[PDB]
């Protein structure tokens, strides 16, 4: 899979929604039925898969599919 596909796959798994619904625009809470704990677990799963610690201030902004994709691609240091 591509990185974008991998991010979407993980979002789908963590939030328990079909891959079809994990569109780039989608907000975890407003669109994909997530709550704040689902969101925390989702960030944790991204941290583990991509071998990176995400600071709280930045993690707090990962609230949509695109946001997650953008952070992963953009923060590889």
């Amino acid at each position: 899979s591509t990185i974008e596909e991998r991010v979407k796959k993980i979002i789908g798994e963590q939030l328990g929604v079909k891959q079809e619904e994990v569109t780039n625009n989608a907000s975890f809470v407003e669109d994909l039925g997530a709550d704040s704990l689902d969101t925390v677990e989702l960030v944790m799963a991204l941290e583990e898969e991509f071998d990176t610690e995400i600071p709280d201030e930045e993690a707090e902004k990962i609230t949509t599919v695109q946001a997650a994709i953008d952070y992963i691609n953009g923060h590889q240091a």
Binding site: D35, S36, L37, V40, V43, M44, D56, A59, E60
Partner: protein
């Protein structure tokens, strides 16, 4: 201690056996110790205690320890309800595997949900 982590009154109509407070400030060990010790003195005749944590930006390992001990020590028939847990404390508690405890500890997204059976 500058008493910067504190319990604040909440203006809401509730039964006399329900206590609703905000926690304002970080729950680092030392501050948490003082806050939960204070809270324990306010529990007489209370069936439900609701803590809104919107203004708790951080919870550290010792602060969590203090929270767990506070919960362990709650009187029989008194349930702690915590709402509006922010990202860092929520991630901290998730990593620690904190779970609700029937009749003793429950979590809610917001005050409305925490007060829905009232």
């Amino acid at each position: 201690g500058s008493h910067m982590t504190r319990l604040a009154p909440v203006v809401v109509d509730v039964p006399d056996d329900v206590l609703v407070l905000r926690v304002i400030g970080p729950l680092f060990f030392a501050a948490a110790e003082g806050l939960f010790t204070d809270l324990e003195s306010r529990l007489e005749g209370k069936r439900i205690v609701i803590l809104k944590w919107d203004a708790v930006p951080v919870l550290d390992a010792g602060g969590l320890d203090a929270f767990q001990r506070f919960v362990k020590r709650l009187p029989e028939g008194c349930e702690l309800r915590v709402c509006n847990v922010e990202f860092q404390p929520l991630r901290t508690m998730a990593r620690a595997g904190i779970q609700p405890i029937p009749g003793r500890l429950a979590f809610f997204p917001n005050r409305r949900a925490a007060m829905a059976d009232l």
